[PDB]
Amino acid sequence: PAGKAAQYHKEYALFRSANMPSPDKLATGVGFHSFRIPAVVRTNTGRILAFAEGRRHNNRDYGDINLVYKRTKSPTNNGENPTDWESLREVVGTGPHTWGNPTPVVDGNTIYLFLSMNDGAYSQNGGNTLPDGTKTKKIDSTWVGRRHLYLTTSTDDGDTWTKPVDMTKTLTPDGQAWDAVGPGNGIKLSTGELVIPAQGRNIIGRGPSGNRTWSMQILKGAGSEGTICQTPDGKLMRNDRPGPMGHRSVARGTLAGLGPFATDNGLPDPACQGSILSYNSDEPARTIFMNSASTDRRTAMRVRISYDKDAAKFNFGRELKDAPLGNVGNEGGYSSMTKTSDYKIGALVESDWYEDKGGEKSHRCIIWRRFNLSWIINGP
Numbered sequence: 001p002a003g004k005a006a007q008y009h010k011e012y013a014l015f016r017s018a019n020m021p022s023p024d025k026l027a028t029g030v031g032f033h034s035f036r037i038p039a040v041v042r043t044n045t046g047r048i049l050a051f052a053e054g055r056r057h058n059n060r061d062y063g064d065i066n067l068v069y070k071r072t073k074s075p076t077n078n079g080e081n082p083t084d085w086e087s088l089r090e091v092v093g094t095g096p097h098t099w100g101n102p103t104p105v106v107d108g109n110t111i112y113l114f115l116s117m118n119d120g121a122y123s124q125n126g127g128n129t130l131p132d133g134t135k136t137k138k139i140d141s142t143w144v145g146r147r148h149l150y151l152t153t154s155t156d157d158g159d160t161w162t163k164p165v166d167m168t169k170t171l172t173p174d175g176q177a178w179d180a181v182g183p184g185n186g187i188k189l190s191t192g193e194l195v196i197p198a199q200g201r202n203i204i205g206r207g208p209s210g211n212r213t214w215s216m217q218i219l220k221g222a223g224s225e226g227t228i229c230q231t232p233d234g235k236l237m238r239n240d241r242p243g244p245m246g247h248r249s250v251a252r253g254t255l256a257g258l259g260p261f262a263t264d265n266g267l268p269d270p271a272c273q274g275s276i277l278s279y280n281s282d283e284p285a286r287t288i289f290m291n292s293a294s295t296d297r298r299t300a301m302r303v304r305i306s307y308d309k310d311a312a313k314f315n316f317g318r319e320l321k322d323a324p325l326g327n328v329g330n331e332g333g334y335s336s337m338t339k340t341s342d343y344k345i346g347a348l349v350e351s352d353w354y355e356d357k358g359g360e361k362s363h364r365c366i367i368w369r370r371f372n373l374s375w376i377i378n379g380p
């Protein structure tokens with residue numbers, strides 16, 4: 001029934017890499033080679049908060065990387081145009097460290113933002129060469145050299161953020177080395193609990209709005225990069241990035257536990273992050289899913305709808321190719337979706353200029369797309 005309406009789509013770069021005109025810089029003068037790893041949420045004011053990793057010197061997952069963000073200037077503009085967005089701010093950039101994997105969730109008048117961190121001397125694989133010629137040590141299980149999990153919060157509609165608090169000791173398993181939270185988004189259940197996807201576990205926030213305490217729900221067979229969603233039937237669903245290239249890994253259950261993860265052959269994935277959004281719970285209930293709908297590459301970005309009460313089946317949906325955007329490099333990769341006040345899907349989508357090929361010098365930017373259901377429904 002939302003298919004009857006006139007299609008609407010609109011798209012433009014929102015985080016502009018250093019190689020692009022009007023590159024995004026902080027008010028301090030700090031600029032960024034690349035922006036990756038988007039997260040976006042609509043607050044209960046209707047203001048949109050967009051988060052990313054500002055990777056300072058190159059496009060690598062490690063090294064000096066700051067967690068940055070923008071807000072819409074007003075809570076009512078819905079990010080309609082470029083000028084509707086504030087200029088870049090910083091959640092956390094302290095030291096030479098990696099701060100990233102933004103994974104926010106809105107809770108009434110509090111926005112919670114989980115993030116991952118590592119020391120600037122360490123990388124996932126280790127032995128990587130830093131700007132100064134120093135080789136990274138490999139992420140390990142020491143306090144110094146593990147991936148930490150941090151939580152920061154805003155009670156002023158994303159304007160300011162409390163000093164990030166290290167929650168690794170309580171919300172990551174003891175002994176763990178590599179870790180990820182999201183990235184993308186957590187969710188607030190119909191029943192009021194907050195759920196944050198993370199590597200091998202959900203992170204559950206309980207208590208009144210804005211005064212939460214968190215615990216781990218350890219999962220069996222989950223991915224490192226998960227999405228969480230409350231399907232129309234009320235159940236939870238993890239839809240995760242696979243280890244190897246092929247297809248999304250999916251599991252369903254409740255706060256008491258999830259069933260086994262199993263590959264969803266309806267959802268090809270190239271071992272890349274995806275995003276998911278419960279769009280509405282009234283009839284017809286809809287779940288939206290975005291990812292690169294390919295087994296081998298990140299450039300087949302597709303958005304889809306499921307009408308299933310457990311989101312078992314997604315339609316073909318529509319290729320983001322159908323509304324391509326010039327002057328932003330080759331679009332595709334990590335994504336994040338939110339619903340806007342004016343009833344569109346707002347998505348951040350990574351794009352890669354690909355100048356040094358897959359080398360570290362290739363600049364990465366992030367696109368902001370909006371589209372209504374009609375635009376998805378009425379594609380080939």
Ligand SMILES: O=C(O)C1=C[C@H](O)[C@@H](O)[C@H]([C@H](O)[C@H](O)CO)O1
Pocket residue numbers: 037061124180224225272
């Ligand atoms: O572009 C990527 O593939 C990527 C970028 C992120 O910054 C990394 O944290 C993440 C990680 O390397 C994998 O999830 C395997 O742990 O992957």
Ligand code: NA
Pocket residue numbers: 064065066093094095096097
């Ligand atoms: Na930094």
